[PDB]
Every structure is written in structure tokens, then in C-alpha cells.
Amino acid sequence: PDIFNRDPRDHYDLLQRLGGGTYGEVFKARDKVSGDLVALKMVKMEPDDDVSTLQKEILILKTCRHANIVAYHGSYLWLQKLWICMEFCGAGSLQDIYQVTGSLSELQISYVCREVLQGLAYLHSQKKIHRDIKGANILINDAGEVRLADFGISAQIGAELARRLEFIGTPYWMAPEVAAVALKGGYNELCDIWSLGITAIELAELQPPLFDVHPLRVLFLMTKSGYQPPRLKEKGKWSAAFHNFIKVTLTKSPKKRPSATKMLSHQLVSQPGLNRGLILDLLDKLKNGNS
Amino acid sequence: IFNRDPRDHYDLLQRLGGGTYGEVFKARDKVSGDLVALKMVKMEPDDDVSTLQKEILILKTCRHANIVAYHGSYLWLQKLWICMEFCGAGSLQDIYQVTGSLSELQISYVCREVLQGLAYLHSQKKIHRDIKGANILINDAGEVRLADFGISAQIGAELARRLEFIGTPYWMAPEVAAVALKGGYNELCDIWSLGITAIELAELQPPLFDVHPLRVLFLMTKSGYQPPRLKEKGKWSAAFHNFIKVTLTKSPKKRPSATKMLSHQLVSQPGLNRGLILDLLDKLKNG
Numbered sequence: 001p002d003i004f005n006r007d008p009r010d011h012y013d014l015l016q017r018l019g020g021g022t023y024g025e026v027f028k029a030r031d032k033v034s035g036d037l038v039a040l041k042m043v044k045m046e047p048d049d050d051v052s053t054l055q056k057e058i059l060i061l062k063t064c065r066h067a068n069i070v071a072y073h074g075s076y077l078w079l080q081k082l083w084i085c086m087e088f089c090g091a092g093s094l095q096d097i098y099q100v101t102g103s104l105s106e107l108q109i110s111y112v113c114r115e116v117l118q119g120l121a122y123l124h125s126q127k128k129i130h131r132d133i134k135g136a137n138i139l140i141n142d143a144g145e146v147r148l149a150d151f152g153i154s155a156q157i158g159a160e161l162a163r164r165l166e167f168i169g170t171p172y173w174m175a176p177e178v179a180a181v182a183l184k185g186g187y188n189e190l191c192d193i194w195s196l197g198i199t200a201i202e203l204a205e206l207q208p209p210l211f212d213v214h215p216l217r218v219l220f221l222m223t224k225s226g227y228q229p230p231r232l233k234e235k236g237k238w239s240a241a242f243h244n245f246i247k248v249t250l251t252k253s254p255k256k257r258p259s260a261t262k263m264l265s266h267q268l269v270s271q272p273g274l275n276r277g278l279i280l281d282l283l284d285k286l287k288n289g290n291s
Numbered sequence: 292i293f294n295r296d297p298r299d300h301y302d303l304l305q306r307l308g309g310g311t312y313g314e315v316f317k318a319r320d321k322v323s324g325d326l327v328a329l330k331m332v333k334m335e336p337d338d339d340v341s342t343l344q345k346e347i348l349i350l351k352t353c354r355h356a357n358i359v360a361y362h363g364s365y366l367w368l369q370k371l372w373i374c375m376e377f378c379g380a381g382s383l384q385d386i387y388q389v390t391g392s393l394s395e396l397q398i399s400y401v402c403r404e405v406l407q408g409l410a411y412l413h414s415q416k417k418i419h420r421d422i423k424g425a426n427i428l429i430n431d432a433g434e435v436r437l438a439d440f441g442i443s444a445q446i447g448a449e450l451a452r453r454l455e456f457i458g459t460p461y462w463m464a465p466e467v468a469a470v471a472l473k474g475g476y477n478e479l480c481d482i483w484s485l486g487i488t489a490i491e492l493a494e495l496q497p498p499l500f501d502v503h504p505l506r507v508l509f510l511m512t513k514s515g516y517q518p519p520r521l522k523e524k525g526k527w528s529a530a531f532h533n534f535i536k537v538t539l540t541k542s543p544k545k546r547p548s549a550t551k552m553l554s555h556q557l558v559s560q561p562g563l564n565r566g567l568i569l570d571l572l573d574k575l576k577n578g
């Protein structure tokens with residue numbers, strides 16, 4: 001039973017629409033038997049869509065499991081709607097949170113990075129790459145725990161897939177090496193480490209470096225040989241350990257960039273007192289105001 | 292570049308083709324009466340005129356017969372207009388959808404002319420990236436033209452979709468950004484696309500056209516992927532089959548350059564001239 005030939009409403013009560021976009025529509029839902037809350041992401045099928053083309057991605061969702069990545073519970077197909085059942089994270093993304101609370105403290109950031117590195121260490125051990133580590137893809141549940149998410153299978157099916165294929169010119173005239181890039185090859189898992197460094201600056205300053213610079217110009221600057229990796233803006237606000245964490249994750253050459261396991265030994269994420277309590281404090285601020 | 296309304300200098304005749312990524316108009320020059328093609332691209336304030344300003348200068352400077360001629364550009368009302376050589380017969384896809392499949396000689400001539408344009412583009416360190424029947428243009432003289440669209444891809448909707456589908460740069464590692472910038476490949480991709488296009492012109496569809504496109508991408512990734520071939524063996528000469536085999540070389544490090552392919556028997560033979568395509572246009576117009 002790769003995908004359930006069942007209406008998910010037979011098993012779940014939809015409670016609330018949490019959001020919707022190109023990634024699909026996401027609902028808060030309650031298991032009818034256990035009473036557990038879940039998130040249901042629904043993707044609308046096109047007339048030509050073929051769910052069998054998702055077989056290998058579904059196998060990965062079934063076999064990859066870790067506390068720090070959003071838990072996959074199953075998939076349903078019914079009346080041209082594809083549903084993915086996932087762990088529920090009631091506080092949304094860290095981007096959703098800091099847009100209300102303001103910048104996180106160093107210790108909150110240190111806790112987040114540790115939890116993200118644990119997830120990434122597992123993914124990399126399974127020879128997978130996240131590819132899109134950022135505040136918007138790090139979810140927080142009401143217990144203060146941290147879970148990696150992604151854009152999701154919506155990019156592999158539905159109207160989003162159709163829009164992407166139109167953009168690349170379809171694949172029929174495409175050379176093999178181009179096809180490899182279109183499936184997001186050409187680089188390795190250490191890109192996630194750099195992305196985590198940028199995310200730590202994002203949690204500290206409310207935007208990644210150069211966010212006020214045109215994206216094309218950033219691309220131009222990033223690939224010049226003289227490019228200087230970014231740094232935290234305010235020096236005295238952050239400890240040497242935090243500055244050094246930014247220094248070593250944002251290593252330009254991938255051959256010299258530390259792995260997720262090596263980073264988990266870093267002073268910043270190895271220090272005592274990192275626990276979900278730090279995020280419970282943030283969630284109180286989010287719900288009730290600073291005072 | 293001109294900071295005027297282009298309609299000051301041209302009369303719009305009719306809309307030839309629109310879409311998400313541009314609109315093309317048939318127009319006539321006021322002072323000279325010449326027919327032209329105008330491609331309108333919508334711009335953003337969030338767009339960057341510095342980058343396109345530099346790309347403008349290249350086209351303004353460098354020519355080739357098999358490249359659609361650049362005549363001028365206009366920025367007005369956040370709309371970029373590019374004035375180009377007008378090709379009265381449209382694309383080869385517009386033609387063969389009416390005429391049926393092309394003869395080997397006609398395909399040989401098309402491939403020669405496309406290779407000449409490619410050899411030139413690659414010498415300018417450019418990549419066409421979208422070689423196919425729909426982007427090979429034909430004028431009423433039966434000549435073959437390629438469109439250089441490099442400018443459009445870094446402004447307007449094309450840039451926005453790129454940022455959306457490939458991603459913004461701000462969280463990218465430098466090695467990832469470098470792939471996102473150039474697409475992550477080389478100019479020999481155009482040589483593969485031309486081999487497919489030759490099959491397209493011979494059979495009215497690229498190989499695997501009836502197969503789900505994602506599945507097609509998956510199959511191309513497999514280690515034992517077999518490059519396509521012409522369906523009907525006996526209908527085509529050995530030179531044509533060898534042309535296909537050589538252009539559809541799996542490894543880019545063994546795929547021949549555009550210049551090397553102009554040495555190939557198929558595109559080297561005498562008798563290849565625009566009269567072959569005049570014959571195709573006559574069939575288009577009459578029965």
C-alpha cells in the first residue's frame with residue numbers, strides 16, 4: 001500500500017485550513033481513532049498526472065525517519081486529490097515566528113542549529129540532501145521542538161510540476177547532463193552546512209545577508225573569486241563562539257567545509273542548557289507579547 | 292537603447308504570438324516601410340536595468356547571417372521592446388504541422404545552417420539552450436535563423452520564474468549559486484538538442500514525446516540510458532543515421548563541437564541551399 005486508495009476524511013477530521021500556495025493546501029486535522037493532531041497537505045491532480053512517477057520519492061518518505069525531520073504518516077489518493085499526512089507543528093516556521101517576535105537570542109539560535117544539524121547529520125548519513133535550509137523550512141511545535149520541512153512533492157506533480165516543465169522547455173530535447181541538473185544534481189550535501197550558517201544570521205538579524213540587494217546581482221557577486229563570506233553585523237552582541245560558528249560553516253570551498261557531524265561538536269551547539277525551554281520562552285512571547 | 296515609445300517609430304500590424312514570457316508583433320517601419328518583429332517583455336521595478344544594458348551592447352555589436360538581426364530596443368512604461376528581423380514563414384514547427392515531415396535533404400540544410408549559427412554563438416561564449424523546431428525560424432527567402440534571447444532570460448517573468456523554481460540566492464552556497472547562474476552545463480547541449488530536432492523534423496515529434504516528461508527525465512538519468520534513434524531505418528541514408536548517433540553522444544566530453552559537426556558528410560554535401568526550403572514553402576501555400 002504505497003498510496004492509500006481511500007478518502008483521508010474516513011480517518012481524519014479536518015479542523016482548520018492553515019495555509020495554501022504553490023506548495024498545496026495544508027490543513028490541521030485530528031485522527032478519529034487516536035485523537036492525535038496531524039497536518040494534511042493536499043495537492044490537486046491534473047488530467048495527465050501519473051502518481052506512479054512518485055514511487056521513488058514516496059519510498060524515501062517511508063524509509064527516512066528522524067526526530068528532527070517532519071514525520072511522514074502516509075499518503076492518500078481520492079477523487080483527484082493527493083493528500084500527504086504529516087506530523088503537526090502548531091507554531092509554524094521560524095520565519096513565521098521571528099516576523100512577530102523579532103530576532104532570536106544566541107541561545108535560542110544555538111538550540112535551533114543543534115537540532116537542525118541532528119536532522120542534517122541523519123539525512124546525510126542516508127545520502128540525501130535537504131537543499132533548502134532556511135527559516136521558512138524549520139518548523140516548531142507547541143512543545144518547542146524543531147523539525148525540518150521542505151517545499152514537498154507539489155514540485156513533482158500537479159500544477160506546479162506543469163509550470164516548472166514549461167519553464168525548462170520540457171525535457172524532450174534536453175541533453176542528459178542538463179536533465180541531471182534539472183533534477184538538482186551537480187553539488188553535494190555540504191551545501192546544507194553553508195545554508196545553516198546563513199539561517200543562523202537570518203534568525204539573528206531577521207533577513208539573510210544581502211537581502212536588500214537584487215537577487216541577480218547577489219548571484220553575480222557570490223560567484224566572483226574575491227567573494228567574501230558574510231558575517232554577523234553587530235560584533236559585540238554575539239559571543240566569539242557564535243562568530244566562529246558563522247566563520248566555519250560559511251567556508252567557500254566545499255572541500256574545506258565541515259560536515260554536519262563535525263559541526264555537532266562545535267562549542268556553540270555543544271554547550272549545556274540547550275533545550276526546548278528556550279523556544280517555549282519564544283512561543284510565550286509570540287502568543288502573549290514581550291512583557 | 293531608446294527611451295521612447297516604440298510606436299513613435301513603428302506601426303503595429305498584428306500580434307503574432309504571446310505568452311507568459313513575451314509577446315511578438317508584426318510591425319512596419321514608418322520612415323522606411325520595412326516589416327519587423329517586435330518582442331515586448333514586461334519589466335519590474337524589481338528588475339535590474341544595469342545587467343540588460345550590458346547584454347544589449349553585445350547584440351548591438353556582433354552579427355551573423357544565421358542569427359535573427361537586431362535592429363533596436365525601447366524601454367517605456369516598464370516594457371522592453373526588442374526590434375528584430377522579420378521571418379515571414381514562422382518556425383519549422385508552424386510549417387511541418389501543415390506540410391508533414393521534412394525530406395532528408397531539407398533537414399540536412401536546416402542542420403547545416405543551425406550549426407553555423409551555433410558555432411557563432413558558442414564562439415561568443417553563448418548557449419542557445421532551446422534548440423527545437425519551434426525556435427528555428429524561416430523567412431520567405433527560405434533562409435534559416437536562430438533567435439538570441441539571452442536578454443529576456445534575466446528580466447521580467449523569465450527571471451521571476453527562475454528565482455521561484457531554481458531558488459533565490461541568499462541561502463545558496465557559492466558552488467550551488469554557480470550552477471544556478473549558468474544552468475550548470477556547457478554549450479555541447481545545443482548539439483544534443485539539434486540531433487533531437489533532426490528526428491523531430493523527420494518524424495513530427497521528438498523521441499519519447501508520448502511518455503510522461505518526469506519519467507523521461509528519470510530514464511535519461513539511468514546509467515544504461517540508450518540515446519534515441521530514427522524510427523524507420525530504411526527511409527534514411529547512413530550519413531543521416533551517423534549524424535544522429537554522433538550528435539546524441541551521451542558524454543559531453545565526447546560530443547562533437549559545432550565546428551567539428553560542420554565537417555560531417557550530412558551537412559557537407561553539395562546541393563544544400565535555400566531552394567530546398569522554398570520547395571517546402573510552396574507545398575505549404577498550395578495543397
Ligand SMILES: O=C(NCCCN1CCOCC1)Nc1cc(F)c(Oc2ccnc3[nH]cc(C(F)(F)F)c23)c(F)c1
Nearest residue numbers: 018019026039041070086087088089092093096139149
Ligand atoms: O502560511 C504560513 N505563513 C504565512 C505568513 C503570512 N505573513 C504574515 C506576516 O507578513 C507576511 C505574511 N506558514 C505556514 C503554513 C503552513 F501550511 C505550514 O505547514 C505546516 C503547518 C503545521 N504543521 C505542519 N507539518 C508539516 C507541514 C508542511 F506543510 F510544511 F509540510 C506543516 C507551515 F509550517 C507554515
Ligand SMILES: O=C(NCCCN1CCOCC1)Nc1cc(F)c(Oc2ccnc3[nH]cc(C(F)(F)F)c23)c(F)c1
Nearest residue numbers: 060061064069070072123128129148149150183184185
Ligand atoms: O532525495 C530525494 N530524491 C532523489 C532526487 C535526487 N537524485 C539524485 C541527484 O540527481 C537527481 C536525482 N527525495 C527526498 C530526500 C529527502 F531527504 C527527503 O527528506 C525527508 C524524508 C522523510 N521525511 C522528511 N521530513 C522532512 C524531510 C525534509 F528533509 F525534506 F525536510 C524529510 C524527502 F522528503 C525527499
Ligand SMILES: O=C(NCCCN1CCOCC1)Nc1cc(F)c(Oc2ccnc3[nH]cc(C(F)(F)F)c23)c(F)c1
Nearest residue numbers: 164166167168169178181182312420421456457471474
Ligand atoms: O532555461 C533553459 N533554456 C532556455 C530557456 C527556455 N525557456 C523556455 C520557456 O520560455 C522561455 C524560454 N533551460 C533550463 C532552465 C531551468 F530552470 C532548468 O532547471 C534547473 C537548473 C538548475 N537548478 C535547478 N533546480 C531546479 C530546477 C528546475 F527548474 F528544473 F526545477 C533547476 C533546466 F534544467 C534547464
Ligand SMILES: O=C(NCCCN1CCOCC1)Nc1cc(F)c(Oc2ccnc3[nH]cc(C(F)(F)F)c23)c(F)c1
Nearest residue numbers: 307308315328330359375376377378381382385428438
Ligand atoms: O506563435 C506561433 N504559432 C502559434 C500556432 C498555434 N498553434 C497551432 C498548432 O497547434 C497548437 C497551437 N508562431 C510564431 C510566433 C512568433 F511570434 C514568432 O516570432 C517571430 C515571427 C516572425 N519574425 C520573427 N523575428 C524574430 C522573432 C522571434 F520573436 F521569435 F524572436 C520572430 C515565430 F517565429 C513563430
